Amino acid sequence: IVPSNHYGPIPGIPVGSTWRFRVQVSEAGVHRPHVGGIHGRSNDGAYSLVLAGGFADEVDRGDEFTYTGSGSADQTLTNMNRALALNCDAPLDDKIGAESRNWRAGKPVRVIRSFKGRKISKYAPEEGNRYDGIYKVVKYWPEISSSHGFLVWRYLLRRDDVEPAPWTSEGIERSRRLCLRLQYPAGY
Amino acid sequence: IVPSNHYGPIPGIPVGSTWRFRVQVSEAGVHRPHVGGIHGRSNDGAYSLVLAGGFADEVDRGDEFTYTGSGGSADQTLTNMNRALALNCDAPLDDKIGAESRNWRAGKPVRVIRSFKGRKISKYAPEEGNRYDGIYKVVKYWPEISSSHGFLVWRYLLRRDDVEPAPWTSEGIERSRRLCLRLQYPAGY
DNA sequence: CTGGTCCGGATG
DNA sequence: CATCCGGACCA
């Protein structure tokens, strides 16, 4: 195993790894919570997050994407929201957010793109949940959701991984080379 | 407003009340699901159900009727909503062969809505819309091969036990009239 | 930022 | 009759 609060890639799980259900992603250690989009500790940082299209105003360019906190009424920079913000190379600011000094100095975040992400993203997988590698918080800030109309906390993530992204020619060749296929639970 | 897990009649909604669409029945609190035939919770009981003639082998005598579980197609199982309705029966739960109530009137109450779509199998269904017919209780339930569909279904016997008279009786008809109960459409429709 | 389930209603 | 367009509810 690895500890629940492990930063960085999970040993033995290559980028391009794909599981049918969230619980499988949880078993593999890649994203512990079965439901929540963010795994983190509010005084340490965030270890991983899931892109599943929950917010219609989010955008995804593959190398970069915006992401939304949780917590309808206004969100606050608390709990998991605070945790992800702490990954950014910048002082914590729960009033106007912050932009990183040197973005690559941020703590790494495992990113999982779900098929449900096709609602807003062209880079999301056709099926299941795909591990897409390590990203870092460039900046975070509060804003009124265009789609929902209450204050949300938004984050800009930028990929910084030695493993090639699954949609690139190189990443596609590697998935094939490692025979990465959609994993169903035993019997299912 | 009553909680979603309320047993018994909805306050202010008399037997004989009729709504054109299922969503209206849902908004009145009488039957929460917009689509499903059974509202319940599988470790509690069932609160309401809708007769809309989806199973051709069901029978209806007004005071009593048989009802069919869902989940079925493959065989049905005594799970989810099926299990919920079974829990209403005054008897130990038995997911192999079912059970019959010791004292049927001690069972948990079930709100029954008869849909006009029920006229496929029943002469007690209304000509139009969805009608609240009052409180029924599960007398017994058992698994059986559907005569009309060929797979195993869970079947239930429901029996009326309500102080409010049934809509099709002389008394119920008088009462619907006296209360000016009419088919209700959504506003504007 | 689950997953399974579902006795509608409209359309044609 | 087949297909779509969905959500609400619960485990």
From Swiss-Prot, chain A:
Recorded disease: Associated with various cancers. DNA copy number loss is found in multiple kinds of malignancies originating from the brain, breast, stomach, kidney, hematopoietic tissue and lung.
Name of the protein in question: E3 ubiquitin-protein ligase UHRF2
Function description: E3 ubiquitin ligase that plays important roles in DNA methylation, histone modifications, cell cycle and DNA repair. Acts as a specific reader for 5-hydroxymethylcytosine (5hmC) and thereby recruits various substrates to these sites to ubiquitinate them. This activity also allows the maintenance of 5mC levels at specific genomic loci and regulates neuron-related gene expression. Participates in cell cycle regulation by ubiquitinating cyclins CCND1 and CCNE1 and thereby inducing G1 arrest. Also ubiquitinates PCNP leading to its degradation by the proteasome.
Ranges in a coiled coil: none
Record's subcellular location: Nucleus; Chromosome
Source taxonomy: Eukaryota, Metazoa, Chordata, Craniata, Vertebrata
Highest taxon listed in the record's lineage: Eukaryota
Domain notes: The YDG domain recognizes and binds 5-hydroxymethylcytosine (5hmC).
Ranges for domain YDG: 8-159
Region (Methyl-CpG binding and interaction with HDAC1): 1-188
From Swiss-Prot, chain B:
Highest taxon, organism lineage: Eukaryota
Stimuli inducing this protein: Up-regulated in proliferating fetal lung fibroblasts and in U-937 myeloid leukemia cells. Down-regulated in these cells by growth arrest and differentiation. In other cell types which cannot leave the cell cycle, such as tumoral HT-1080 and Hep-G2, levels are consistently up-regulated.
Segments of this protein annotated with the region Methyl-CpG binding and interaction with HDAC1: 1-189
Record PTM text: May be autoubiquitinated; which may lead to proteasomal degradation.
Subcellular location: Nucleus; Chromosome
Domain YDG, residue spans: 8-160
Signal peptide: none
Clinical condition linked: Associated with various cancers. DNA copy number loss is found in multiple kinds of malignancies originating from the brain, breast, stomach, kidney, hematopoietic tissue and lung.
Record function comment: E3 ubiquitin ligase that plays important roles in DNA methylation, histone modifications, cell cycle and DNA repair. Acts as a specific reader for 5-hydroxymethylcytosine (5hmC) and thereby recruits various substrates to these sites to ubiquitinate them. This activity also allows the maintenance of 5mC levels at specific genomic loci and regulates neuron-related gene expression. Participates in cell cycle regulation by ubiquitinating cyclins CCND1 and CCNE1 and thereby inducing G1 arrest. Also ubiquitinates PCNP leading to its degradation by the proteasome.
Binding partners and assembly: Homodimer; disulfide-linked. Binds methylated CpG containing oligonucleotides. Interacts with H3; the interaction has a preference for the 'Lys-9' trimethylated form of H3 (H3K9me3). Interacts with PCNP. Interacts with HDAC1. Interacts directly with CCNE1; the interaction ubiquitinates CCNE1 and appears independent of CCNE1 phosphorylation. Interacts with CCND1; the interaction ubiquitinates CCND1 and appears independent of CCND1 phosphorylation. Interacts with p53/TP53 and RB1. Interacts with UBE2I. Interacts with ZNF618. Interacts with UHRF1. Interacts with FANCD2. Interacts with ATR.
Entry's free-text remark on domains: The YDG domain recognizes and binds 5-hydroxymethylcytosine (5hmC).
Protein name: E3 ubiquitin-protein ligase UHRF2
Gene: UHRF2
